[PDB]
Amino acid sequence: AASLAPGSSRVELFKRKNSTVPFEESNGTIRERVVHSFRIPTIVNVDGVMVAIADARYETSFDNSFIETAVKYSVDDGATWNTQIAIKNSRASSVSRVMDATVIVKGNKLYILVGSFNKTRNSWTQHRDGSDWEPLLVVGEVTKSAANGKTTATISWGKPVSLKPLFPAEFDGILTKEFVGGVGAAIVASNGNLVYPVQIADMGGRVFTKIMYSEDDGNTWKFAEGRSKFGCSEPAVLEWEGKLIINNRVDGNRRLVYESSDMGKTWVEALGTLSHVWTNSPTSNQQDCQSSFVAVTIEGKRVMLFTHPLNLKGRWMRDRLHLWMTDNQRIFDVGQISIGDENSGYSSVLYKDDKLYSLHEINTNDVYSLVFVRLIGELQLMKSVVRTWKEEDNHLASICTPVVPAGCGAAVPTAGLVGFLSHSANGSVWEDVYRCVDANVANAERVPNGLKFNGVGGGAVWPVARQGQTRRYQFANYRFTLVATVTIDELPKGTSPLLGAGLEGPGDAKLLGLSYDKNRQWRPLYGAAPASPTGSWELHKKYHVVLTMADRQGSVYVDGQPLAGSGNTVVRGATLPDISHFYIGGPRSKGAPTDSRVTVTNVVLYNRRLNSSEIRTLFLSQDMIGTD
Ligand SMILES: CC(=O)N[C@H]1[C@H]([C@H](O)[C@H](O)CO)OC(C(=O)O)=C[C@@H]1O
Numbered sequence: 001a002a003s004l005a006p007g008s009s010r011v012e013l014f015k016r017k018n019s020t021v022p023f024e025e026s027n028g029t030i031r032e033r034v035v036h037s038f039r040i041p042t043i044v045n046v047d048g049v050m051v052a053i054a055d056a057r058y059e060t061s062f063d064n065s066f067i068e069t070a071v072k073y074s075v076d077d078g079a080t081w082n083t084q085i086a087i088k089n090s091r092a093s094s095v096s097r098v099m100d101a102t103v104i105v106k107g108n109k110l111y112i113l114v115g116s117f118n119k120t121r122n123s124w125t126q127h128r129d130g131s132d133w134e135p136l137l138v139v140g141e142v143t144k145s146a147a148n149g150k151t152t153a154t155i156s157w158g159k160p161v162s163l164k165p166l167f168p169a170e171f172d173g174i175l176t177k178e179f180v181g182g183v184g185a186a187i188v189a190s191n192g193n194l195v196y197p198v199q200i201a202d203m204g205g206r207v208f209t210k211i212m213y214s215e216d217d218g219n220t221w222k223f224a225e226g227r228s229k230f231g232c233s234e235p236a237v238l239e240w241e242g243k244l245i246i247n248n249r250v251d252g253n254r255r256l257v258y259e260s261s262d263m264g265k266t267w268v269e270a271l272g273t274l275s276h277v278w279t280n281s282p283t284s285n286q287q288d289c290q291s292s293f294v295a296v297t298i299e300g301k302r303v304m305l306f307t308h309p310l311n312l313k314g315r316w317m318r319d320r321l322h323l324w325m326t327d328n329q330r331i332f333d334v335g336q337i338s339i340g341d342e343n344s345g346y347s348s349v350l351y352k353d354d355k356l357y358s359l360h361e362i363n364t365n366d367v368y369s370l371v372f373v374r375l376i377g378e379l380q381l382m383k384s385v386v387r388t389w390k391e392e393d394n395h396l397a398s399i400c401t402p403v404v405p406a407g408c409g410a411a412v413p414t415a416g417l418v419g420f421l422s423h424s425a426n427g428s429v430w431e432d433v434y435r436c437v438d439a440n441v442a443n444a445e446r447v448p449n450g451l452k453f454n455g456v457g458g459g460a461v462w463p464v465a466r467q468g469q470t471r472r473y474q475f476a477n478y479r480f481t482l483v484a485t486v487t488i489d490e491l492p493k494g495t496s497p498l499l500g501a502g503l504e505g506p507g508d509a510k511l512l513g514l515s516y517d518k519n520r521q522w523r524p525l526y527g528a529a530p531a532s533p534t535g536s537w538e539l540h541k542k543y544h545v546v547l548t549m550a551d552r553q554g555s556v557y558v559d560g561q562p563l564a565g566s567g568n569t570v571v572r573g574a575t576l577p578d579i580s581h582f583y584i585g586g587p588r589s590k591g592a593p594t595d596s597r598v599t600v601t602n603v604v605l606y607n608r609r610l611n612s613s614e615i616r617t618l619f620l621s622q623d624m625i626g627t628d
Pocket residue numbers: 040063099100115123124125180233234288289316
């Protein structure tokens with residue numbers, strides 16, 4: 001949906017210049033105080049109690065102003081709420097502030113880490129030293145009661161404890177200045193560790209991220225050895241299949257995502273899955289924004305949810321908040337959860353008792369409220385998509401493939417299967433069976449499990465960089481396998497394209513691909529190498545084509561055997577390639593008026609290089625995988 005979906009709705013929960021908080025005076029008296037702006041939302045579930053956490057920016061929405069940490073909590077899924085100030089600021093000056101709450105729930109405890117500042121008027125990364133700052137950890141305890149039918153809850157907040165004595169003065173060379181949590185909901189790892197992703201500023205103002213974790217429920221804390229590149233901030237972390245996945249804010253460039261299998265000791269950029277997929281605006285050169293990144297189980301399948309504005313207006317406007325759902329292979333855009341063209345901002349998502357919610361910013365004139373959203377239409381779509389993913393994976397994995405010399409052979413590969421183009425299509429769209437990235441079609445006619453091309457630019461474009469802002473097939477620049485069943489229907493005049501990966505840039509360079517020629521020979525394309533002919537094919541005969549690329553090496557297989565010239569380097573330099581799209585047939589909107597008379601069916605895309613057993617299995621099961 002292009003806006004909050006039919007069936008969903010929201011309320012303004014923390015209302016700018018309206019909702020009050022129980023401000024505690026120095027003398028201990030409480031006064032209901034109006035709050036200019038509420039920012040930096042997090043919503044979590046603590047033993048059945050929704051707890052919403054926010055910066056209460058009392059006087060202005062500016063970062064360096066008088067701020068305290070507010071909490072609203074509900075025992076009836078948002079029907080009613082109680083309000084508190086969980087963490088007070090130091091009251092040292094007119095701009096004293098506790099801000100940027102990062103939260104972990106473990107049992108009936110909430111662990112909140114905030115940055116506390118006394119008097120600075122400038123931005124944290126630019127301070128002369130860390131003398132105005134303390135990282136404060138606060139523990140809240142949620143207690144539920146039951147009085148003749150009615151359930152109520154209380155939350156007690158402990159005294160803040162400064163973690164400044166535990167912050168090293170240096171990291172491998174780097175002289176430290178300050179750190180804050182990554183903002184939003186953090187995690188308890190499967191081993192019980194409290195895991196905060198942190199953002200650290202060095203003396204010069206460079207920012208980078210790290211994991212800070214505790215093995216003893218916050219009694220002690222350790223900074224793990226790994227770190228992000230410089231320029232990463234506001235990290236969000238979740239645990240996936242035994243690894244921490246750290247998703248970073250990157251002002252002015254695409255978002256970096258890292259994985260660590262050893263509690264943050266070693267970080268590896270997620271080039272094969274999520275790194276550089278998301279970004280800060282269509283042109284990637286704008287201020288970025290915080291994102292929520294949470295693992296949940298929907299319809300029996302573990303998935304990750306990610307929120308971020310499209311920010312088409314740029315700077316801090318942060319219009320058009322979207323929610324994506326991924327299983328680390330496919331990436332589905334659930335849609336826009338903010339309304340129309342409104343400015344949004346920081347966000348949080350919660351899945352609780354089979355209902356989905358969001359708490360996020362709305363901004364008019366830099367006065368901010370937080371809306372509490374019931375994502376009813378969105379959850380319905382998510383469940384449908386997860387059912388599609390499970391049904392197709394289970395179907396493929398259950399195919400009885402032919403036995404090979406060494407009941408059934410090996411399973412049709414489903415691990416890392418990202419996209420599949422098969423029977424469903426129309427005149428302009430070839431549908432991804434996995435519902436994420438369709439291919440665009442021209443001059444085509446439907447055939448079982450695919451399309452027959454006839455006319456100028458007859459073919460399909462499966463966009464890679466051409467997806468635009470959110471690059472869900474960015475993994476292909478690091479590795480991929482592309483598979484298809486093909487027939488050549490008419491001889492070409494000279495050479496004509498069939499299947500491949502095109503590159504952005506001058507001319508019409510290809511990374512890896514296959515063409516065919518008037519002599520009935522194949523013409524594999526291995527990067528920039530002169531594409532000489534090899535082998536032999538016949539008109540009207542079906543052939544299986546597999547292109548593999550990993551470790552900068554490319555191979556082209558026909559009928560399960562590599563063509564001459566395979567197995568060499570196809571990308572030179574150290575710079576990742578920038579694939580524009582996969583082409584199927586001879587699509588084009590300009591240049592030579594290519595017209596490849598071929599029929600292509602069952603196009604499969606994987607985010608890894610399939611092994612020999614897998615390639616053979618696909619070659620032997622071509623008549624078995626189609627959607628019909
Ligand atoms: C401590 C602090 O300043 N946090 C602020 C953060 C920060 O200024 C930026 O990441 C540059 O370091 O920015 C934003 C923001 O809406 O973009 C809100 C945070 O409250």
